[PDB]
Symmetry: C2
Subunit: 257 residues, 2 copies
Amino acid sequence: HKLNTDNPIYAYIVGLFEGDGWITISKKGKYLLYELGIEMHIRDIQLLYKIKNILGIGKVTIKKLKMKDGTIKEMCKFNVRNKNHLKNIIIPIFNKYPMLTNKHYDYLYFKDNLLKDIKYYNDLSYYLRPIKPFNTTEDILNKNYFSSWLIGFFEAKSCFSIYKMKTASFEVSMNNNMEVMLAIKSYLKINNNIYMNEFNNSKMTTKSINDIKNVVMFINNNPIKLLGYKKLQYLLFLKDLRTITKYNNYFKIPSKY
Amino acid sequence: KLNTDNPIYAYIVGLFEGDGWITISKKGKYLLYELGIEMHIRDIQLLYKIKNILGIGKVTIKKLKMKDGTIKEMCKFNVRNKNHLKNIIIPIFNKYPMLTNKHYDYLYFKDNLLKDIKYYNDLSYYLRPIKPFNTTEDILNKNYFSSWLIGFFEAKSCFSIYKPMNKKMKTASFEVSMNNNMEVMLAIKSYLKINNNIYMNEFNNSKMTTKSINDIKNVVMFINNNPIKLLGYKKLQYLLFLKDLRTITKYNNYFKIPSKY
């Protein structure tokens, strides 16, 4: 039979791969390599096995990076290279819950070529990701799987931090995709968000007490959950937030997640 | 080991708890273990979705030969393979436990299956406890209640629009079929902030009903905002309900009825 895709966690997966993964076609001599992949830190290796498990396809590997200094850094990776697996599992998932940013174009190209069985590099047309945003902030807000996509995006690109009395902030690393950032600001009713640019490291942040409450309650009330390290950071964040007077009193920081 | 992080499995448990069964039955000296569910033909596509989501099981059509000479139809989905039950079904129900007394059927089913009981003679006696397993507060404390609720609504809720012959205009009502689950019914009333519900008993038809504009508002928004959706006929009934609800002045003026589910 075919892949049933009415399950929201597949939207969470798209969010995760849109944030930190990739779906490309590359030149392997006179042949082509099609690959859906994602690389994360060792702290998220279990998350990659979870992905492998949910998708039923793929391979989890560990890569050793030879640093300049002579040391070795580690990363873990999940990828799918089997053409039939891509056509039967991945295509249907992304068709059902397409990516939100311009990265979506990478998908259409990947898909068009894959389904046409292009295998020699010389039969492959030229491609450069468009600079125009595929969707407007309102097209995003009209998508009924936004909140699910968002947990996967947060899993990959959000950050919870408590710093020195004390203050709490929620940030989302952006890679010039304001339409998505505005959809998030709106959907979550975040008011005191300040944008930044630290070494072209553009991000969106907020520390106000109500904004934090809104973020915590959206994350907490969503049936779609953080699965890897990001979940631990979140739970540690709450653990801390409970000790900060102005926050723990302003609302009921939940104890179950 | 099966990954059970997907809340749609809680929806599945919610659906089976409402219209399904998980039992051990005799077959002479042997024992049949079965997770099963029977629905009307209108939901045959839904059974196929369950099948593809669980990755196991079989869908069949049953012909009930009535005494009047007519053949009535129903469709069914079931899992009988011991390995499939141990490796898929057990982990799901362990992760997202049923909420009513029916949960006892599960524990019983699971203890025997794991102990590898094969003969009816080795089967200890069993009668589903009468006292509820959970309290309303225990229910409200489960973090997967809202996902379970959709599967349970898929099976036991009912959206109806109609014009009684004693009132000039149509009324909107949401009802949930009862079955000795008042602790669960109270958790729903509480969780959905329902304030004008009434109870029915039309031919032992214990159920909960509400027609108040605010109650209906709460139900429609809960359903529409949930990432976990109605997948079968119930969904179609839900969508036809909204389309009509839009034409009833008192409900339409009270709140913004969603146009996309």
